């Protein structure tokens, strides 16, 4: 079901990223590696060849939107507000990170209010951890008492993608392919 994923009218916000179980389809990964409509196509712990040749119990396709200059954060061992607070790959990841520019789909004149990302967290995410919480974020020392006072904020932010933004600020659709053998990194058979 690579249609539901790559061609969806809409993608999830990065903080509330979507997960689709694939596992059981039939995937010519090599045709994806050739597109050149994909600005990005890094595989980890496996080459693009032999991407059909690895064994696993589960495969997942994760998908979301981030701005152009945040794509480099979707990779093992990265830092920043996306890898710390939104979508965290593990160091021993096996799978591929696909990305492409979606300015003509995800930007709106005036500003898109629909794509969100989390700005703050008390600690960094766990690999593949999903946080859809909206608790008030205490930035300073005085606790918030359930109210967004002086140092106390809703923890989410909007990208406001505009067609005219610079390319580092334009939206990119991202699909992470993940290969698991019993919660361990899949290898080649």
């Amino acid at each position: 079901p690579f249609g539901e994923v790559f061609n969806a009218t809409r993608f999830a916000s990065v903080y509330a990223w979507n997960r689709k179980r694939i596992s059981n389809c039939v995937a010519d990964y090599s045709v994806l590696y050739n597109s050149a409509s994909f600005s990005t196509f890094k595989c980890y712990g496996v080459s693009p060849t032999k991407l059909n040749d690895l064994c696993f119990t589960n495969v997942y396709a994760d998908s979301f939107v981030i701005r152009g200059d945040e794509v480099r954060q979707i990779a093992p061992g990265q830092t920043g507000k996306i890898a710390d607070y939104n979508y965290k790959l593990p160091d021993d990841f096996t799978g591929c990170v696909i990305a492409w520019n979606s300015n003509n789909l995800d930007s709106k004149v005036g500003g898109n209010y629909n794509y969100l990302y989390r700005l703050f967290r008390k600690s960094n995410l766990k690999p593949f951890e999903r946080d859809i919480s909206t608790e008030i974020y205490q930035a300073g020392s005085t606790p918030c008492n359930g109210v967004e006072g002086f140092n106390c904020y809703f923890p989410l932010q909007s990208y406001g993608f505009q067609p005219t933004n610079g390319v580092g600020y334009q939206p990119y659709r991202v699909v992470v392919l993940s290969f698991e053998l019993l919660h361990a990194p899949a290898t080649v058979c």
Partner: antibody
Amino acid sequence: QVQLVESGGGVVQPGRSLRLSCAASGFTFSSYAMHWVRQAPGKGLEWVALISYDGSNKYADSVKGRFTISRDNSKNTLYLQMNSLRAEDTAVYYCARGLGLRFLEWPISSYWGQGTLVTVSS
Amino acid sequence: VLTQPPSASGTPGQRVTISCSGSSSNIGSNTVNWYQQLPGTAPKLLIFSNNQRPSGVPDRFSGSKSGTSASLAISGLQSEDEADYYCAAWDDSLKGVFGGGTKLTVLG
């Protein structure tokens, strides 16, 4: 102690003008988009306008030529100038904060003001 | 610009749903939101981004969205739910729209 205290309501002769104020105090008002929403007694909420935390003003069609939204961030105050007022402009006017900082200007956040009643009549 | 049924009702403990119809300019392309309003009082946000809840909103409140429609589901209805519910959605015009509102009566 997040407060939104609005004032300026009362009775206005039709056709004349009126200015609403909304004074904020418990937070960094400079960082948030602000909205105005009206409600006539016994009827639905009608969105009026928003202003970004700096220069980006959107208006409802039903007021687009007559109302202007303003901020004075150094006084922590939101304004609403109303002109050519008409009997159907009679409502309770609420100010309200955007859901989040900066760009999360919409939707509205359930931090609202008290509401003030505008009456357009002779 | 957004149409809601004017009335809904249920018995304490039932599940009540409230519908919202829109257009391509709003619900069809932007997220939908829901507000609870008690009599003459400022509304409270209880759903954003189609189905996300602000902190404090019980999970028996639930939001969904498909195409140009949106629906609000109130499971385990309590008397303190008696109120006006408004769906809301940005319009690509750069407006911002509240539906007509649905007054919910708790009957038992």
